[PDB]
Ligand binder design. Structure first.
Ligand SMILES: *C(=O)[C@H](CO)[C@@H]1N[C@@H](C(=O)O)C(C)(C)S1
Length: 263
């Protein structure tokens, strides 16, 4: 609905920075609404969903196992590793790492998984192979959050991320069991409270993944819908703002409120 675009423009006024937005129909892939859909924005932690999508594909192909245990050390710990820092002694399984990377946005977990698949260059190749010639991962955590103005490293476009997420969640790329596992991890997101979730009505479904980086970079990708079933994909990214985290959170939540109101 165009009233949501009014709010998105208002968010740009409030934050003094670009805001990229897209609403996509999950079933048909039809673009319902867009704002700067083809401009690049840093992915930040939203790439973690793509990463686990690549891991799940390897599992489907028998090249990896959900139960395989990874024995890392304190040398691997990077900033913001709430889960991995507590399991140094016994390590964690691939399933646990993806759960941690998605639900808690654990940085070390992402790096560990990144190594198992072959690094940023393999994740980018995976994306390219599934039709996404835009999204690219170049660095590891935490460097990928730099958000240098005009830098194309570690970026995506709202339309690319949206269509890629649709394919991962509903396409034939992953087995049904794996598609469900990915959605299950996203639905269990514990760190996106003040964003779209704060505007979600009772009974609605939401599977998401947020990100922060930087130069005011903030973003979120989500699959949501009424009656406990997702029917649309929403992608929101912003970068460049000098506003506080709270201010950025509020704007995203208000865009969400408009989106829901005009569903
Ligand atoms: C990803 O953008 C960062 C780690 O690089 C994680 N996601 C943030 C967020 O979504 O708010 C975080 C502060 C939970 S850490």
């Amino acid at each position: 609905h165009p009233e949501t675009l009014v709010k998105v423009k208002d968010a740009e006024d409030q934050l003094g920075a670009r805001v990229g937005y897209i609403e996509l129909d999950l079933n048909s892939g039809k673009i319902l609404e867009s704002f700067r859909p083809e401009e690049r924005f840093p992915m930040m932690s939203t790439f973690k969903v793509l990463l686990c999508g690549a891991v799940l594909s390897r599992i489907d192909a028998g090249q990896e196992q959900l139960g395989r245990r990874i024995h890392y050390s304190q040398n691997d710990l990077v900033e913001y590793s709430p889960v991995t820092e507590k399991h140094l002694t016994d390590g964690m399984t691939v399933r646990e790492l993806c759960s941690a990377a998605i639900t808690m946005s654990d940085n070390t977990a992402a790096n560990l998984l990144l190594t198992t698949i072959g690094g940023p260059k393999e994740l980018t190749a995976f994306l390219h192979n599934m039709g996404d010639h835009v999204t690219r991962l170049d660095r590891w955590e935490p460097e990928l959050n730099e958000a240098i103005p005009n830098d194309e490293r570690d970026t995506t476009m709202p339309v690319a991320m949206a269509t890629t997420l649709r394919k991962l969640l509903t396409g034939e790329l992953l087995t049904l069991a794996s598609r469900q596992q990915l959605i299950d991890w996203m639905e269990a997101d514990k760190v996106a409270g003040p964003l779209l979730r704060s505007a979600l009505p009772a009974g609605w479904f939401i599977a998401d993944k947020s990100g922060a980086g930087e130069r005011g970079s903030r973003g979120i990708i989500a699959a949501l819908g009424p009656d406990g079933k997702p029917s649309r994909i929403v992608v929101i990214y912003t970068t460049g703002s000098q506003a506080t985290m709270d201010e950025r959170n509020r704007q995203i939540a208000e865009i969400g409120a408009s989106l829901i109101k005009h569903w």
